[PDB]
């Protein structure tokens, strides 16, 4: 059934699993027309498919051409996500196929279940966790490859950089969710925290800066402070 606080360790066991987040698949700008009506313009999106154990990220870029001449795009976006996840599973060798796919939004369950009928032993699950994967487009290198795409494209990343050389998957996922939560709550302040010291750079082959273990503790503190400072604003508390 549903993935929650109670069964959290299951994310880091040796059963292959993927999270699928569809919140950046169908992206629009809303604008006024010459006649004073409102219209949307689509921009490039992405499917965020992540192995939480290994950090392997399958970023399927969704080019605006896939919407051309289609109706009910917010509905189509769920089916296109399920089609592309199904195509990704079929493209993997049998020993690499996931045993579970966890969707971050319950509206993905039926579309993915119907696309995966050929895989009855792959469990399609919702989650009670509120995961911040919508903030994936606040990671500069992911945003850059999505916006520059001129055609549909799959790009592979490790969202943990080299962290698993020094820390467990559990700790790496906790760092990632705290960084994305901060970027989601106050993007400008989060990015300021990450780049304030110019001597710490992002390797060409990495997404995040090259922090020592001690510098990661300071960064993680600064991110928790940002989230609480922001919460002290939203709610007047």
């Amino acid at each position: 059934g549903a993935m929650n606080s109670s069964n959290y360790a299951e994310l880091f066991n040796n059963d292959i699993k993927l999270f699928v987040d569809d919140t950046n698949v169908y992206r629009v700008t809303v604008h006024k027309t010459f006649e004073g009506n409102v219209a949307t313009k689509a921009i490039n999106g992405c499917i965020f498919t992540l192995n939480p154990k290994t950090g392997h990220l399958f970023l399927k870029i969704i080019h605006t051409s896939v919407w051309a001449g289609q109706k009910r795009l917010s509905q189509l976006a769920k089916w296109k996500t399920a089609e592309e996840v199904s195509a990704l599973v079929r493209s993997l060798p049998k020993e690499e196929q996931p045993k579970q796919i966890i969707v971050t939004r319950k509206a993905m369950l039926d579309p993915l279940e119907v696309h995966m009928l050929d895989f009855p032993n792959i469990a399609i699950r919702p989650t009670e966790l509120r995961l911040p994967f919508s903030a994936a487009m606040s990671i500069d290198k992911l945003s850059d490859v999505v916006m520059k795409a001129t055609e549909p494209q799959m790009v592979l990343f490790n969202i943990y950089d080299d962290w698993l050389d020094r820390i467990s998957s559990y700790t790496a996922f906790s760092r990632l969710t705290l960084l994305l939560r901060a970027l989601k709550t106050n993007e400008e302040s989060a990015k300021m925290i990450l780049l304030s010291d110019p001597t710490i750079t992002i390797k060409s082959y990495h997404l995040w800066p090259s922090f020592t273990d001690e510098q990661w503790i300071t960064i993680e503190s600064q991110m928790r402070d940002l989230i609480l400072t922001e919460y002290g604003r939203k709610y007047n508390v």
């Binding site: 189509l76 089609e83 039926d110 579309p111 119907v114 696309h115 050929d118």
Partner: protein, 300 residues
């Protein structure tokens, strides 16, 4: 007009014949039901006064043989049996009629209710859903599970309704996932009507049989089958006009006949709200929508 004689009534029981019912007392001199209209299937059903659990009963057609009921004190139920000796049977019925020990099938001449509930129901189709080929009549009860229920456990005592499953390879063509899930027309028209049922008459016959088993025995699996066959039609954008017009009539008579007090257990809120208010056919079931709104506005 045919007759189903009863050897006796040793235990106190409520006896149904189609939509009608009669209380019989322990050892009351009851010897059966006469004036049963030829041309339709019928059901004769039982609920014991001392254990109102297991409603059970027999689907039959008097054109297919001479049937009687006899209580079996070992198996503790009223059993249907066929009498193969025509002259013996005629002589039994004549005596019981002469002694007026029979209730008369109480049909009002104006009243087409039973025809309207059984229009497409044929004994030969019942005998394929309920498999017991040594008898020309069919036993159904409260507890019998469906082939679909058994997949999700004695297969000889199962209701072999046609399996309908909206998230199955049968329902969904590879490469038409979204189209087939949101518009079930290919599942209805190609797989089920052309493929399995051969025509709308057989599909409606199964729908009507499923409703009657749900209503007369509170058979839960039958109720699931009735709702699935309605939902498959209402969820298809492309349905022949004659099927929609006929479905509205079928459902109107089913909703009209349902006991008011059983709406809560026999009607699925999600299916009916979807079928009348959101589905492709939300505007195609005028008679059904009007009787549902006036009789069961709470459910909606």
């Amino acid at each position: 007009m045919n007759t189903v004689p009863f050897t006796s009534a040793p235990i106190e029981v409520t006896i149904g014949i189609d939509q009608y019912s009669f209380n019989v007392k322990e050892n009351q001199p009851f010897h059966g039901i006469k004036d049963i209209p030829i041309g339709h299937v019928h059901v004769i059903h039982f609920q014991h006064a001392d254990n109102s659990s297991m409603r059970y009963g027999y689907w039959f057609d008097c054109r297919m043989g001479n049937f009687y009921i006899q209580y079996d004190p070992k198996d503790g139920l009223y059993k249907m049996m066929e009498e193969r000796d025509g002259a013996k049977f005629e002589n039994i019925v004549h005596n019981f009629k002469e002694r007026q020990m029979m209730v008369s099938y109480p049909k009002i001449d104006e009243d087409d209710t039973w025809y309207n509930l059984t229009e497409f129901v044929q004994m030969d189709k019942i005998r394929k859903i309920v498999r017991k080929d040594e008898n020309q009549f069919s036993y159904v009860d409260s507890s019998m599970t469906t082939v679909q229920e058994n997949e999700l456990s004695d297969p000889a005592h199962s209701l072999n309704y046609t399996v309908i499953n909206f998230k199955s390879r049968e329902a969904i063509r590879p490469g038409h996932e979204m189209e087939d899930f949101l518009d079930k027309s290919y599942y209805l028209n190609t797989v089920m009507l052309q493929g399995i049922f051969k025509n709308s008459s057989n599909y409606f016959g199964e729908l009507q049989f499923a409703f009657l088993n749900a209503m007369f025995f509170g058979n839960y699996g039958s109720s699931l089958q009735w709702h699935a066959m309605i939902e498959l039609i209402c969820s298809s954008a492309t349905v022949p006009k004659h099927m929609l017009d006929k479905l509205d009539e079928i459902l109107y008579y089913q909703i009209k006949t349902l006991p008011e007090q059983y709406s809560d257990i026999l009607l699925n809120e999600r299916v009916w709200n979807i079928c009348l208010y959101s589905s492709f056919q939300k505007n195609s079931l005028h008679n059904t929508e009007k009787i549902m709104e006036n009789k069961y506005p709470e459910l909606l």
